[PDB]
Each structure stands twice: as C-alpha cells, then as structure tokens.
Amino acid sequence: MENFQKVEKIGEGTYGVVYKARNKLTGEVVALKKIPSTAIREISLLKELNHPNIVKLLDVIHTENKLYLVFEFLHQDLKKFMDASALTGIPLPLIKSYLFQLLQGLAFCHSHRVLHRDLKPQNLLINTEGAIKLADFGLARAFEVVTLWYRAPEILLGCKYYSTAVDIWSLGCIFAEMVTRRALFPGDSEIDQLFRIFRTLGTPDEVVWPGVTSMPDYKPSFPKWARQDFSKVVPPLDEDGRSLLSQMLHYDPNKRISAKAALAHPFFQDVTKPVPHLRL
Numbered sequence: 001m002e003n004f005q006k007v008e009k010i011g012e013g014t015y016g017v018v019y020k021a022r023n024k025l026t027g028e029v030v031a032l033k034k035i036p037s038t039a040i041r042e043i044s045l046l047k048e049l050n051h052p053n054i055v056k057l058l059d060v061i062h063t064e065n066k067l068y069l070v071f072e073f074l075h076q077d078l079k080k081f082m083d084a085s086a087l088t089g090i091p092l093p094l095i096k097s098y099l100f101q102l103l104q105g106l107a108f109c110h111s112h113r114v115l116h117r118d119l120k121p122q123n124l125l126i127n128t129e130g131a132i133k134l135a136d137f138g139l140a141r142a143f144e145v146v147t148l149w150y151r152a153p154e155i156l157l158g159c160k161y162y163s164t165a166v167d168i169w170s171l172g173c174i175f176a177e178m179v180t181r182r183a184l185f186p187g188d189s190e191i192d193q194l195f196r197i198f199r200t201l202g203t204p205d206e207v208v209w210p211g212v213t214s215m216p217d218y219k220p221s222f223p224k225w226a227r228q229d230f231s232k233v234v235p236p237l238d239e240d241g242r243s244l245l246s247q248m249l250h251y252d253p254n255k256r257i258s259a260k261a262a263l264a265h266p267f268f269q270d271v272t273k274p275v276p277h278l279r280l
C-alpha cells in the first residue's frame with residue numbers, strides 16, 4: 001500500500017470501503033477497495049474477465065491478512081446520476097444506451113459462468129463518454145444495511161443454487177427505476193421485499209412458476225395478490241420497453257430472458273450512445 005496515496009473515501013460497499021487513490025509509481029488515479037485461499041484464486045480469475053462494460057480489476061494485493069482490490073476509477077455511480085436527474089428524468093435514449101451496455105457486460109460475464117449476484121445503482125459506474133460499467137463482478141462468490149430492492153424472488157424464496165437469471169432480474173428493477181424515477185420494489189425486510197414483488201407481479205403459483213410451492217422459504221399461507229399491468233407499473237415506457245421488462249421480470253428463472261436474447265429485442269433497434277450531462 002506504500003505505493004498508494006489515498007485521496008478521499010468515495011463509498012462504503014458490501015465487501016468494504018472504496019477510496020479514490022493515487023498510484024505513486026504510474027501516476028494512475030484508481031478506486032481502492034479494502035476487503036482465505038479460495039478467495040485469492042477466485043479474485044485472481046476476475047482480473048482476466050475484461051470487458052468495456054466491466055470496471056477493470058487492475059490488481060489484487062494480499063498483505064498482512066488484508067485484501068486490497070485496485071480498480072480503474074470512474075467519476076460517478078448511477079445512483080448519484082439518478083438523484084441528479086430526478087426532477088427531469090434520464091432521457092429515454094440514454095436509459096436505452098445504459099440498459100444495452102449493461103446487457104452486453106452481463107452477456108460477457110454470463111458466457112464465462114460468472115454471476116454478479118448484487119447488481120444495484122451503487123455498483124453501476126458511468127463516465128463522461130456515455131459508457132456505463134458493472135463493478136464488483138464475481139465478488140459475492142468469493143465473499144450499513146445491504147439493500148434488498150434488486151434481489152431476485154428465487155433468492156428470497158431460499159434457492160441456494162441460483163443462476164445468471166438473478167442478474168437479469170436486478171437489471172430489470174434498475175431499468176424500471178431509471179424510467180419512473182422511483183424504486184420498483186423498495187422492501188425494507190425480506191418478507192416486505194417478497195410481498196412488494198407479489199403485489200405488483202401477482203403471487204406466484206405452479207402455473208406461472210412450476211416448483212415454486214416446493215421452495216425452501218415458500219409458505220402456502222402467503223397472501224394471493226393479482227398481477228398488475230405493466231402499463232400501470234412503468235408509464236411512459238413504450239410497448240417494446242414494457243415487453244422486454246416483462247421478460248426480465250418473469251418469475252421462473254428458466255423463462256426469464258437471457259442477456260444475449262435481450263440484446264436482440266426490438267427495443268434496441270434504434271439504440272444510440274448519447275453523451276450524459278455530468279457535473280464532476
């Protein structure tokens with residue numbers, strides 16, 4: 001760490017505190033995260049998982065039982081950008097560009113059998129060029145109240161062997177939040193989170209999700225709520241956007257759209273790469 005001069009505390013992530021710092025050797029400005037042999041091996045594998053929509057993991061430093069992760073630095077997270085854009089809304093072409101890029105990032109990681117598992121606006125980073133990138137990819141497999149708002153229903157229902165579909169669910173919740181300027185399912189407990197999902201998408205049953213009633217935390221005593229139309233859930237999103245969202249929010253992880261199939265969705269026929277309005 002003698003090679004890094006800390007600049008400021010930029011955040012407090014799930015796996016540790018994130019600092020902006022300066023590399024004394026290269027003059028590089030980085031994001032330094034201060035966090036078991038299995039963890040070293042898994043983290044080392046993430047250094048090779050390089051994609052333009054993945055925050056680059058520059059180095060892994062294991063010194064005095066402490067673990068530091070050195071990332072490329074981006075100037076803002078999507079949560080702060082969404083707060084800054086709350087009175088006007090993020091323009092739909094920029095929402096579409098960000099969703100398209102994030103789907104490219106997920107399609108890449110998922111093709112390498114790497115899951116994020118904890119996507120949230122707080123770990124989506126943006127730059128002045130119009131790029132958006134996924135941070136903390138693969139850290140959940142290796143290792144303040146942790147937000148449940150973007151948690152897939154199979155996780156809340158006790159599935160211990162969940163799939164890449166959990167990331168599609170989280171990204172669908174973020175897509176809805178960019179469009180409406182409000183969190184889709186802002187639960188403050190696991191049951192509140194599950195019941196918020198049920199109140200909007202309907203209580204799942206064996207018809208829409210075969211095997212759901214046999215899940216570890218499923219209870220036959222769950223209240224039975226009717227599903228709502230997406231026209232009510234995400235106005236003023238057009239029919240292509242609502243169709244894609246509905247496929248990202250299917251209850252059955254096996255029915256849920258893949259990142260690769262989502263990239264071919266008609267919603268992206270007119271996708272562009274606009275420049276965001278960023279104040280740094």
Ligand SMILES: Cc1nc(C)c(-c2ccnc(Nc3cccc([N+](=O)[O-])c3)n2)s1
Pocket residue numbers: 010011012013014018031033055071072073074075076077122123125135136
């Ligand atoms: C949860 C995270 N894990 C990593 C690795 C993060 C990461 C990676 C690269 N650049 C940045 N920039 C940035 C800029 C402003 C504020 C914040 N914030 O932490 O609130 C972050 N963060 S954020």
